[PDB]
Amino acid sequence: PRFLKVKNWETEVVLTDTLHLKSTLETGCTEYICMGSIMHPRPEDVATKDQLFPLAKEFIDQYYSSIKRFGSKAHMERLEEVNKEIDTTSTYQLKDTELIYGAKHAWRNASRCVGRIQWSKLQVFDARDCTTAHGMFNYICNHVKYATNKGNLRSAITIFPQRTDGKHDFRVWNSQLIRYAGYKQPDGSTLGDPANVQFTEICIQQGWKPPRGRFDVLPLLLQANGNDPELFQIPPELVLEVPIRHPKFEWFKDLGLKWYGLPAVSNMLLEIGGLEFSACPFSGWYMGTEIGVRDYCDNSRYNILEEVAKKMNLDMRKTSSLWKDQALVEINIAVLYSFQSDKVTIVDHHSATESFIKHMENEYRCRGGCPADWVWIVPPMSGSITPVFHQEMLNYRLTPSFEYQPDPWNTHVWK
Amino acid sequence: RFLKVKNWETEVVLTDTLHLKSTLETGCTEYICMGSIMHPSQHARRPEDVATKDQLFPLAKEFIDQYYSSIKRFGSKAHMERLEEVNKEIDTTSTYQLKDTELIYGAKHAWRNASRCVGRIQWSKLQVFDARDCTTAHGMFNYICNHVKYATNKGNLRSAITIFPQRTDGKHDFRVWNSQLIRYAGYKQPDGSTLGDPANVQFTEICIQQGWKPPRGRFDVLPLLLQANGNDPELFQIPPELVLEVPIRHPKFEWFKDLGLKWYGLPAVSNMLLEIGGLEFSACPFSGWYMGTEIGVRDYCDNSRYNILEEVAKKMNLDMRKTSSLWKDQALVEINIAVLYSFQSDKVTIVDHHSATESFIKHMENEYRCRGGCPADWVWIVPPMSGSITPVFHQEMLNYRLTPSFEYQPDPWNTHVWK
Numbered sequence: 001p002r003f004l005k006v007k008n009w010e011t012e013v014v015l016t017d018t019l020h021l022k023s024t025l026e027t028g029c030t031e032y033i034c035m036g037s038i039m040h041p042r043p044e045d046v047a048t049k050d051q052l053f054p055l056a057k058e059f060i061d062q063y064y065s066s067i068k069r070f071g072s073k074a075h076m077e078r079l080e081e082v083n084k085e086i087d088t089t090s091t092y093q094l095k096d097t098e099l100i101y102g103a104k105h106a107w108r109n110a111s112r113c114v115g116r117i118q119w120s121k122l123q124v125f126d127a128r129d130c131t132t133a134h135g136m137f138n139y140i141c142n143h144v145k146y147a148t149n150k151g152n153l154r155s156a157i158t159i160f161p162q163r164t165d166g167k168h169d170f171r172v173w174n175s176q177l178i179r180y181a182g183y184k185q186p187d188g189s190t191l192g193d194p195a196n197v198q199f200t201e202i203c204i205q206q207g208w209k210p211p212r213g214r215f216d217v218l219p220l221l222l223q224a225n226g227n228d229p230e231l232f233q234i235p236p237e238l239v240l241e242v243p244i245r246h247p248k249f250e251w252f253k254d255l256g257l258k259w260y261g262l263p264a265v266s267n268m269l270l271e272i273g274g275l276e277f278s279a280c281p282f283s284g285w286y287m288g289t290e291i292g293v294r295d296y297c298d299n300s301r302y303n304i305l306e307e308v309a310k311k312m313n314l315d316m317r318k319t320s321s322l323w324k325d326q327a328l329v330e331i332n333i334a335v336l337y338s339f340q341s342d343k344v345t346i347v348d349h350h351s352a353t354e355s356f357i358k359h360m361e362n363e364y365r366c367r368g369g370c371p372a373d374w375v376w377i378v379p380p381m382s383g384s385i386t387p388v389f390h391q392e393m394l395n396y397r398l399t400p401s402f403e404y405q406p407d408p409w410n411t412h413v414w415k
Numbered sequence: 416r417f418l419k420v421k422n423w424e425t426e427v428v429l430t431d432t433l434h435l436k437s438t439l440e441t442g443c444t445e446y447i448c449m450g451s452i453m454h455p456s457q458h459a460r461r462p463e464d465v466a467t468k469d470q471l472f473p474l475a476k477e478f479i480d481q482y483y484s485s486i487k488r489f490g491s492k493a494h495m496e497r498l499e500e501v502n503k504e505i506d507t508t509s510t511y512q513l514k515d516t517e518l519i520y521g522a523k524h525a526w527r528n529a530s531r532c533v534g535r536i537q538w539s540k541l542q543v544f545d546a547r548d549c550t551t552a553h554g555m556f557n558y559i560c561n562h563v564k565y566a567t568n569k570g571n572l573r574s575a576i577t578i579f580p581q582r583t584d585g586k587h588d589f590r591v592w593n594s595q596l597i598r599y600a601g602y603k604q605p606d607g608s609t610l611g612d613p614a615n616v617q618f619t620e621i622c623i624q625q626g627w628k629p630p631r632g633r634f635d636v637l638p639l640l641l642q643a644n645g646n647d648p649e650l651f652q653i654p655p656e657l658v659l660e661v662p663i664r665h666p667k668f669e670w671f672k673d674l675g676l677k678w679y680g681l682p683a684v685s686n687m688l689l690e691i692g693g694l695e696f697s698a699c700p701f702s703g704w705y706m707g708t709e710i711g712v713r714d715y716c717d718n719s720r721y722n723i724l725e726e727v728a729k730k731m732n733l734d735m736r737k738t739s740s741l742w743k744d745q746a747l748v749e750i751n752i753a754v755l756y757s758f759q760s761d762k763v764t765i766v767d768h769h770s771a772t773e774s775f776i777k778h779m780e781n782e783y784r785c786r787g788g789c790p791a792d793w794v795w796i797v798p799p800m801s802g803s804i805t806p807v808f809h810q811e812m813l814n815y816r817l818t819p820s821f822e823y824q825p826d827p828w829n830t831h832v833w834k
């Protein structure tokens with residue numbers, strides 16, 4: 001249209017979205033069916049010259065508008081300069097300012113991220129000169145060290161060279177920089193994180209010597225210039241971990257639970273002006289429920305509800321005792337208490353969602369909207385006692401963006 | 416063209432063709448998703464007031480076709496005569512009348528098609544009370560009382576809908592002004608706070624402004640405000656012996672009962688519009704039984720509702736200085752334990768969000784297997800607490816609009832011209 005309205009049914013606040021008119025890529029929905037809850041709606045899908053020109057123009061135009069230099073001499077020469085590169089080299093190179101701007105705005109545009117109030121405080125590490133897996137390891141270690149900051153976590157991203165022909169991609173094969181291994185046992189059981197069973201097998205196959213324990217930090221599996229990925233052990237002093245204890249339940253520490261302090265997504269693709277940065281690990285800090293609800297309590301994950309409820313002496317014979325709900329809360333209290341006690345940055349789902357509402361309202365004020373994916377923004381527990389549950393949100397895809405990409409081991413041509 | 420939904424816990428993939436029969440816009444486009452907009456679309460199947468023939472007949476034909484298709488006629492003698500009967504009726508009244516079988520089919524299928532309803536595994540077990548002979552608010556009150564008594568069934572709740580006369584010209588609407596048949600009053604206090612149910616403050620004020628004598632308590636069952644044939648609405652007190660209530664106590668916290676909380680047993684939505692073959696049934700109160708989280712999470716713990724979280728947390732002796740103590744989450748669980756314990760103790764039908772969502776997954780698989788799909792609104796189906804430890808959270812869903820359907824409609828006091 002030219003205006004869309006979103007209402008908060010708790011506060012009655014109504015905001016007007018004009019920004020959705022600038023959307024240029026599909027949500028997955030059609031006019032007659034909504035695919036809002038679908039999680040994911042060839043490597044040679046590299047953009048041609050003619051495809052790249054308007055994408056580049058759009059981004060450069062966006063960047064020069066953002067800095068109030070639209071139409072300027074430097075805006076027109078940059079456009080001419082980009083077009084020359086696309087003409088001659090079939091691609092182009094972002095200036096450092098553009099790269100920073102692009103990476104920050106991909107975060108700003110990530111409709112599934114509840115932590116976007118921080119988007120403009122992002123530390124961008126330019127790793128576009130990297131050429132080997134050893135180099136990538138170095139950049140990633142410096143990233144982890146900077147981001148962890150002895151527990152006072154700082155959001156950061158490290159951007160490796162962009163895709164060229166799709167045959168020389170840089171990839172972190174890890175889904176996060178720090179995750180725990182998972183081992184399927186012969187008896188069907190799983191040790192460690194079941195989500196990482198296949199990637200653990202890949203590592204072991206590449207030569208990793210697994211400790212075979214419940215909380216083994218995985219090695220990095222790093223791929224530079226489309227070569228076979230190489231294994232690297234993150235220095236253990238760089239991996240900040242928090243042992244999980246409960247403020248009231250003495251026995252909780254006896255579950256032997258711990259988690260890492262630094263959530264660092266490493267398998268997504270950063271798209272800026274048609275350029276595809278296939279390796280761009282970014283990191284922030286945790287919302288407690290990511291660990292306490294999903295990592296610990298998903299049936300497919302560590303799946304500790306039964307253990308915690310047993311220790312809590314809960315009546316587990318029928319679902320209506322809500323024993324799962326009761327143990328879920330205590331687990332999440334323990335995660336928060338533990339990070340806070342160890343002075344490792346964390347945010348609880350109540351603070352995060354309240355902050356996101358403030359962020360959303362500010363984005364509407366200054367930007368004309370804030371794309372938001374309700375299905376992901378609402379925390380995985382206690383949904384409606386958080387303010388975002390009652391917040392209408394419009395979802396739409398702006399670029400620069402973070403995009404999913406196939407797991408590398410499905411498409412990699414081994415040398 | 417033919418869409419798959421995956422459950423990320425089980426890796427069960429379902430393949431949806433039923434969406435190809437969807438008629439109305441969701442509100443989304445290829446470029447915007449309105450999945451969390453409460454009312455994303457005003458796309459209606461028929462225009463403002465009484466449709467012309469070329470507007471109403473095609474809708475009628477489509478529903479009659481669907482009904483006779485459903486019973487493995489289609490083109491049968493009775494189907495073709497029905498089309499001519501509907502055709503003649505629209506020619507001579509600008510509307511048409513549903514047979515009892517069509518009405519029952521339509522009501523059950525509007526429920527079957529309600530993408531936001533997690534209870535739909537019961538859809539074909541629906542008692543339909545035909546009230547299309549009703550002419551006055553007194554008659555509506557009589558019909559609603561019978562509905563309430565039948566549906567309540569001394570605590571063994573039974574799904575029911577009562578269907579009053581369809582809209583004719585729009586000036587003669589039958590409306591239940593209550594949003595549910597049984598809700599508690601909300602009172603605006605002189606000191607600015609609110610007593611009772613804040614959602615119902617405005618409707619409570621209409622009732623008082625209509626002559627209702629509020630007892631001014633926290634659990635005052637609202638009177639019925641019934642409108643028949645476009646006339647001014649009339650107040651009626653539901654006989655309290657028909658209004659089953661459950662005192663809320665806790666199986667461990669002996670002090671919980673001293674909070675003086677209760678809730679009613681029967682959720683009976685009464686402000687929605689039932690749409691069948693272009694017919695608009697503007698008064699179609701329907702009821703089932705509660706999912707515990709509707710009372711314990713939304714009714715009791717929404718900020719602009721009863722908001723009893725601090726009260727319960729205080730009794731539980733929780734650290735309420737910061738959020739990260741998760742004191743709201745702890746009290747929230749205890750309230751929902753209490754709600755379930757209270758209803759089950761009093762042998763009043765209720766379902767917890769774990770079993771209700773599990774049944775819905777089973778309903779989805781049934782529907783894909785026999786019907787080629789099942790429209791489902793994830794935003795509404797996932798419960799308001801402990802989302803991801805329920806299976807629906809991990810279930811991709813396709814949302815699309817099938818007819819017959821339940822629709823929202825304006826609150827009649829924004830519309831009604833008094834006399």
Ligand code: HEM
Nearest residue numbers: 107110112113114115118155157282283284285286287402
């Ligand atoms: C700084 C603190 C941050 C917090 C508390 C936070 C919180 C979250 C949470 C809870 C999720 C959902 C994760 C899940 O449920 O699996 C998420 C998703 C996401 N975050 Fe953030 N985040 C933060 C920082 C960042 C940063 C620094 C970036 C990028 C530079 C980022 C980009 C994203 C993206 C792209 C997604 C969703 C990916 C998708 O589309 O599925 N976030 N965030």
Ligand code: HEM
Nearest residue numbers: 526529531532533534537574576701702703704705706821
């Ligand atoms: C019998 C047990 C039933 C259960 C457990 C159940 C459960 C629910 C719940 C929890 C909701 C969401 C309500 C809210 O969050 O405010 C809902 C919505 C709904 N229910 Fe059911 N329900 C049942 C029966 C019925 C019946 C008998 C009908 C109609 C004949 C019906 C029609 C609907 C509709 C149309 C909606 C969505 C209304 C909208 O679009 O806003 N339900 N149901």
Ligand SMILES: CNCc1cc(-c2cc(C)cc(N)n2)cc(C(F)(F)F)c1
Nearest residue numbers: 263265282283284285286287290294295
């Ligand atoms: C259970 N969390 C796993 C997970 C966590 C995060 C995430 C990312 C960042 C930067 C911060 C944070 N706090 N979380 C992002 C994703 C994904 F893949 F969706 F982007 C998944």
Ligand SMILES: CNCc1cc(-c2cc(C)cc(N)n2)cc(C(F)(F)F)c1
Nearest residue numbers: 682683684701702703704705706709713
């Ligand atoms: C939070 N309760 C309010 C509410 C309850 C229900 C509802 C309806 C039925 C038949 C059963 C049930 N268990 N619930 C339906 C709605 C609405 F408006 F969406 F249709 C709202």
Ligand SMILES: C[C@H](O)[C@H](O)[C@H]1CNc2nc(N)[nH]c(=O)c2N1
Nearest residue numbers: 037038039375376808809810811
């Ligand atoms: C099927 C559904 O889309 C899927 O389970 C989603 C639900 N919402 C989510 N929300 C967040 N934050 N993270 C998730 O992984 C998911 N998974």
Ligand SMILES: C[C@H](O)[C@H](O)[C@H]1CNc2nc(N)[nH]c(=O)c2N1
Nearest residue numbers: 389390391392451452453794795
């Ligand atoms: C903004 C959002 O769509 C709105 O608050 C919805 C969210 N999901 C819901 N889900 C249910 N079951 N009931 C509701 O009232 C709502 N409210």
Ligand SMILES: [Zn+2]
Nearest residue numbers: 029034443448
């Ligand atoms: Zn949509």
